[PDB]
Write a protein that binds this ligand. Sequence first.
Ligand SMILES: [Fe+3]
Ligand SMILES: [Zn+2]
Lengths: 145, 613
Amino acid sequence: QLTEEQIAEFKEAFSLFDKDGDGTITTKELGTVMRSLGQNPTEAELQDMINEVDADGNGTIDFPEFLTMMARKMKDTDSEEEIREAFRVFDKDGNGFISAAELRHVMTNLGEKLTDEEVDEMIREADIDGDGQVNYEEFVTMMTS
Amino acid sequence: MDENAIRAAIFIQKWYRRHQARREMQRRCNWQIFQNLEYASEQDQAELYKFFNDLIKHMPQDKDDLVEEFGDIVNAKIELPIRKNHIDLLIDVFRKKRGNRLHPKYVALILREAAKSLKQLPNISPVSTAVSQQVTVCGDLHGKLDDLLVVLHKNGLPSSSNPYVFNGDFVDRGKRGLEVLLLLLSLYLAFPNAVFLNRGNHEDSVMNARYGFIREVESKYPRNHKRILAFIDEVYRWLPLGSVLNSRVLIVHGGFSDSTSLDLIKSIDRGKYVSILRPPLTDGEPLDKTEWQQIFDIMWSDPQATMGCVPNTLRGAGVWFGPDVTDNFLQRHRLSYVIRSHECKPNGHEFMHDNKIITIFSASNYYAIGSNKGAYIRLNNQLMPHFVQYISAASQTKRLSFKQRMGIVESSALKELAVRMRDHRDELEDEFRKYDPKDSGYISISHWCKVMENVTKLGLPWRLLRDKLAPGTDSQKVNYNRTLDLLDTDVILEAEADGMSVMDALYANKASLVAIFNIIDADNSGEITLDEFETAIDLLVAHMPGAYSKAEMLEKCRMMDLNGDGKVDLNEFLEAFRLSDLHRKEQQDENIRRRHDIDPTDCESKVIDPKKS
Ligand SMILES: [Fe+3]
Ligand SMILES: [Zn+2]
């Protein structure tokens, strides 16, 4: 199923998170290892994926089930173009200079809320200027590259 | 509010979380590279102990000298009775980035008084928290004077109501090592009932010559470096080997082992072991292998998750100890837990073996700017460890974007890795050529990874580094021409020029040569024979690659043995080693060429609950 290079690249990326080197990692870091290889599932997808793979609540996952999970997930993917429209619909007047207050307000309450640290880092990197407004275009261009 | 806003929010959230995970993976890879690079050099340095240990088996069983110093000199006055006001003056002198050189007389006085005072202390120092109701433990400092000043400012100066325990490694990694040692000794002298010191693995004359401390001392005091180094080496002799807290908690630098017994360490003649990596200087009494092994295990051991006790091949010295041996040792010595400081940690502190081994590390920015955060432990009367964290030089750190803050660390790691990899350029190129039977110029990814692992033997995740060591490569083939060009860059050669390496024993430690050539003495008259000389060079070249090739040394003796084999002919006999080193350096060089002020307020801090960490 997986490519000849992938079956080794995934194993090499697997050992960076194993505390004991036994090929099994804690389940709480699944959303990091799976994200790091180009996938972008939400925590709801993570819960759905862990329910079908964990039954006794052990909290341990080894290499083969991770490989099967990634093979199942890889079948769908998205490009970077669809990111722009998400920010476009958040500009009520097409100014392109959305301020930090509503940007923090929306995604800390709407959708699937993040913690305080994530938004702290995000509007710390994005809001370079002290005016309190963030240019979305430069943000996306500099982070995507 | 509408469903479109929800869709946009969740899409952006997914994208941001993916990028955060990517950055986390990059951080972990860089940390792995740094740790493996440090361990690869410590392991190579540690084989001198094995060489000495198996060479032993094979062979049969107040004077005034300081002179005036050139350059700018600070007129600070330090008297023999050290008081609190001297500490503030010393801090003020050392605070400035320039014009911080003390007069050699005061340095000699401080070192001599500290050496005289440290002789009376026992091997293991008992610390009682009944009166002070508080005790503080700090980790490695490694010349980070600003970190020590930050700790002092945040926690106050040591006193009878606020003692300190500095857990070794005071020097030889940073650019300001001497100041940390002088300040610590002055603080100990001013407060003898409230400051305790523990010897570390870097408190060795052999290790200092390899990590730049001796170079710093020679540069700072060109006219007096010899006697200052002698005084410092004398100070290293009497530092206590460990500390016992409240008769319940043991504080050691490295760790322990299955055969380690405190009832034996307390009876070791500490004065013999001026150096750890080379045999102690006994008075004709043949040395004991057990005590030296005891001290080595105490100083150099490391913990491991798996069970059993195996020899620590990762660092090249010491032994790995798991939870089973830790529990057995604690039950045998009736202790609660052991505090440790050998290994650096990303957060500065960690727990191991079911909260029974506490690792601490008080050096911030150990590898590069932003690598890790320092930490120190505050213990209450019930010995519950409160952890604090801090990062120095925050003002310069805040003047960069997050991408640049990651890029500086990434560039430092890549530069260090390429500098280390520069040594094996010829063998690496030959291995690459062998794997290309049709000289097409492109080899498979698996072959590339195998060649890299076989040559470097660092165990790094090479497949993740494919796009950085060899950029612009496809998913199936990698050209070695771009890789070879990376180590052939001029700036890499310039950086590698300043990096000291193994050997250079005469420049590093002439005492090492004296120890070797006194150990190989079959008789006590001081005369040796060439067959023993041949055996010694054979054993030396058996461990150190490309040492003498058994040719230059033998030819040198044949030029000198006019009256045959005999005594070690003093300096002119070491001219053989001198000319051999010069010839080797010239031979390798020809082959290569033939192609701000300290500020404690400039920091960020955080206090962590014992159970929240
Ligand atoms: Fe250290
Ligand atoms: Zn150490």
